Symmetry: C4
């Protein structure tokens, strides 16, 4: 019945960076905020790496798209490729064999993101989504997938990246706070 992200040191969390590729960069209004959140969670995972993996999927890469350069991946990143609309492919499954929580971000809300989270839920992981770092080409598709997923509690939760950073460091006197606090002073390309 647990209700938000637990302290970062309880279990493991995968950051899952979904399909942020070149074909899309122009097609989605808040693509840049998605990039920002991808960077934010990237730097966060470097703060706390014995507790968090970071995962990049690229979808049919060569046929329109490699993972936009403005995302500076961590050296530890598990970069993987697929044609499945959902991120849950053989590679990522085993890479989640010991992971309790998935923080899922990227494009598109109603397509890969949506299928990815239903699969995660079926795997019994808790899923957490910064709305912050989600997008679709069209509003109607996005807005509908977002409401569907909001009805998928208690194991699915939509908040934002600032909410999520704060949920993992439950205290401002946390050994990692000064580092994490610094991320939070960065401002998005498109104002929230």
């Amino acid at each position: 019945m647990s209700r938000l992200m637990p302290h970062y040191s309880k279990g493991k969390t995968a950051f899952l960076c979904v399909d942020l590729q070149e074909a899309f960069s122009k097609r989605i209004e808040n693509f840049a905020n998605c990039v920002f959140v991808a960077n934010r969670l990237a730097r966060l995972h470097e703060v706390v790496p014995e507790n968090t993996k970071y995962i990049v999927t690229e979808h049919y890469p060569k046929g329109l798209g490699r993972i936009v350069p403005e995302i500076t991946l961590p050296k530890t990143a598990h970069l993987i490729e697929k044609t499945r609309f959902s991120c849950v492919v053989p590679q990522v499954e085993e890479l989640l064999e010991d992971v309790d929580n998935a923080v899922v971000f990227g494009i598109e809300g109603h397509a890969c993101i949506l299928q990815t989270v239903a699969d995660l839920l079926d795997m019994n992981k808790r899923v957490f989504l910064p709305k912050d770092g989600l997008g679709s080409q069209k509003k109607t598709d996005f807005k509908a997938a977002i409401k569907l997923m909001s009805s998928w509690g208690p194991n699915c939760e939509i908040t934002t990246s600032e909410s999520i950073l704060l949920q993992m460091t439950k205290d401002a006197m946390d050994p990692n706070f000064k580092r994490i606090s610094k991320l939070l002073k960065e401002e998005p390309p498109i104002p929230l």
Copy 2:
């Protein structure tokens, strides 16, 4: 506890094209997007016919309305007529005796659509609705029926037609993808 549309080859799905008739064509702002979605799912069913039926109801046809010509029905279509506000009439019931999923689209959200889905739910079918291809004459009636139905999970889900096509072909290397992909490159009369 299943969470989205399953792969098209698991079970059967009825496309249910509800009351898109002449009296209404002018009375509903997004009537044309409803037509677009009706065509979209029509062409889709022709892609995958051993797995999907297609059903058109016309409500009190002669007294104001036959099914708008700009919808090019599949040859396989089960076209039926009624006065019941809900589509669940004797004819359609038996035509669902072996169907697991219903994709319901048309007019009006708060009237025939709304009654139709509560009946489907009572029949234990999973219902999937492209918000895309729904409408009412007035916002207030639509918006309210849509929220009611969003609270009818897990067996009712409101997304859109692009979300739904992608949910049925779970992979971009699917034998049917190139065909289905082509539908998705078509753009609606009224931008989403």
Copy 3:
């Protein structure tokens, strides 16, 4: 697990017309649509009286407010008065001893309406609310009470008065349809 209003002839339904009085007439933007819906359900109940009661509460009447004249009450109306914020007072309780469904409409969404429906739910009645015929002085109070109540399913449902008339006459060949249809051709003071 029933999902909408049943056919008018299955059980009994109270129409509950809540606090539409003079003090308020000016204080609420859609007061007039509330009046319209009050009239609509009034005429409806006259169509089907062996199955529906009609109930008017006036709240502290003499100290600012009798029930606005532009509502033409049915002769059968059970007009009652109180100081309780909720409509569930001794008089109305016994007047619901054999009633299965309550259609609740009036003012204010977050105050009398809100308390009234929580009490009804505690009495095991199904409650149905035309958003149509609800209002508050301020948006913020209304909008919040409306969302709370939307989360009170399966025995609470918010739709509109056209949705509700159609749900009770499940067929356009219903002996009462022509009469009920005629109500639906009336247009509200403030467009929906």
Copy 4:
């Protein structure tokens, strides 16, 4: 299965005034409405003190912020300080050992407020939140935390301060009504 605030004399209620400090005063658009609600519940608790405690947390006070002067605290107030993002610290826990309901208000919706309510829920208290007296620096963070929490029923409820005052005095002939009514005639800085 209880559905709103019970009459003020059934059990105990803590008013919890969360982080309304100087650093924030300018950073949040509706900060002043939060102050208004803080005052409103302050005066209310003085009306009914054998049944309600009032609690102010200040978060890292000296390092940017003491509790804004325009809030005139009750003499009975339990003013406490912390670095935990959530209000549930050792001091407040024991101060809730005999409290059934918490009315939670302040800043920020997605941060301290959000963590505070998940902890309260874990403690089996009913939580009630006047949306009225909540805020965040950015819309996106607020709006998302608000929806998450709306899905946390039956023991969490978001309404407003007028709804909440009325829910605790279930009758306009209540010995405390004239006093409480007077609070309700006060108007917020930023119109609801």
